[PDB]
Design a protein around this ligand. Structure first.
Ligand code: 2TM
Length: 368
């Protein structure tokens, strides 16, 4: 491989310890190393306080300082250094105090500079058995942050693990608490589930855990997911969900999509409702919308080639505009222009009228 994150984190730990502080790799990096995977991120936990970290490193980003977190920039990587803490934020004085309030045992391990695993809650055994289990009392972990309930669902698909039975029954009992979680955090976890492996298992856990009873419009996630295959874009999960149920975008708008996301969903839904697609269809809709609609209805056409082979790609290529029509018509500017521009546009897109000012003028003077 060519990873640098672990190496950089080792250097960060070394500098922290050279200055008298304790420092360890924590979080998913430890889980990933034990799974033989290359970590996406490597967090460091330290007895150093944020301003003490800033003294030791030339380049830091300080946005999370209130939470105890300094981002250390080193060797072209960024390592998050967080003081021992628990969230609710309270700084604490030992590693174990920090670890004992984390969500799941596989996420509550630490590793030293010398590769020793500190695993007070059996993270290694659960990792080996492929079990997502809350640290300590699950009722406690889920009251501290109800989003953890949904995180457990997400990890089951992402790692192909099961959810520990006691933990899962705890989620069932506290699923109501999900109502307090910012919808942006909910959407972020669901977007991950939609692109992760084993997503059908994640969706069955979502239902079995009772989360679908209390998530915003939670019942809508209970569709048949067998024929869903992610395209790497979480948006396709939301469109698949709606299409399977013959529902419209407004039914999921609680999740606070961006305008472009919403447009992509709404336009794709339109395409799936349109009986037959022709040149104007391929002209007016984006490739991304055409491809997502094709994906969700099961078509496999070579969409890109059809769009590319149209006479023009967009309105900016049109050889005529409203002010040419004002000249030829002798009429004052008004909404009629858009009507007539579109007539001309259609004729060009269907390859009937040449995209040529003088020939469009001929057509117009004859039609008007
Ligand atoms: N609610 C939470 C959120 C986080 N944590 C703890 O913070 C660490 C970093 O999570 P993180 O959010 O920074 C990345 P993660 O979500 O684990 O996915 P990835 O590693 O596959 O990229 C996790 O390992 C948990 O121990 C927690 O105890 N309760």
């Amino acid at each position: 491989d060519d990873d640098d994150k672990m190496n950089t984190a080792i250097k960060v730990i070394h500098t922290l310890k050279a200055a008298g502080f304790e420092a360890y790799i924590v979080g998913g990096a430890v889980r990933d190393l034990l799974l033989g995977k290359t970590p996406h991120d490597v967090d460091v936990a330290s007895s150093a306080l944020p301003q003490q970290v800033k003294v030791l490193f030339d380049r830091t980003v300080d946005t999370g300082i209130d939470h105890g977190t300094v981002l250390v920039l080193l060797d072209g990587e960024g390592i998050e250094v967080t003081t021992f803490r628990t969230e609710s934020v309270e700084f604490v004085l030992s590693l174990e105090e920090d670890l004992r309030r984390r969500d799941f045992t596989i996420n509550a391990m630490a590793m030293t500079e010398d590769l020793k695993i500190i695993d007070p809650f059996g993270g290694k055994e659960d990792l080996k058995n492929k079990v997502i289990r809350a640290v300590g009392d699950p009722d406690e972990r889920f009251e501290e942050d109800a989003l953890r309930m949904l995180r457990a669902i997400r990890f089951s698909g992402q790692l192909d693990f099961i959810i520990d039975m006691k933990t899962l029954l705890s989620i069932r009992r506290h699923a109501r608490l999900i109502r307090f979680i910012a919808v942006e955090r909910l959407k972020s976890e669901i977007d991950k589930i939609f692109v992760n492996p084993s997503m059908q298992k994640s969706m069955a856990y979502l239902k079995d855990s009772v989360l679908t009873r209390f998530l915003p419009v939670g019942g809508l996630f209970e569709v048949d997911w067998i024929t869903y295959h992610t395209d790497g874009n979480p948006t396709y999960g939301w469109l698949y969900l709606l299409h399977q149920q013959k529902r419209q975008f407004t039914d999921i708008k609680d999740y606070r999509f961006s305008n472009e996301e919403k447009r992509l969903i709404e336009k794709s839904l339109e395409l799936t409702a349109l009986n037959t697609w022709d040149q104007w269809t391929f002209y007016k809709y984006t490739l991304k919308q055409l491809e997502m609609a094709s994906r969700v209805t099961g078509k496999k056409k070579d969409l890109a080639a059809i769009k590319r082979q149209l006479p023009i790609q967009s309105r900016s290529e049109l050889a005529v505009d409203g002010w040419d029509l004002i000249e030829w018509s002798g009429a004052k500017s008004g909404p009629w222009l858009k009507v007539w521009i579109e007539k001309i546009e259609r004729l060009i897109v269907y390859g009937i009228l040449k995209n040529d000012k003088e020939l469009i003028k001929d057509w117009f003077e004859d039609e008007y």
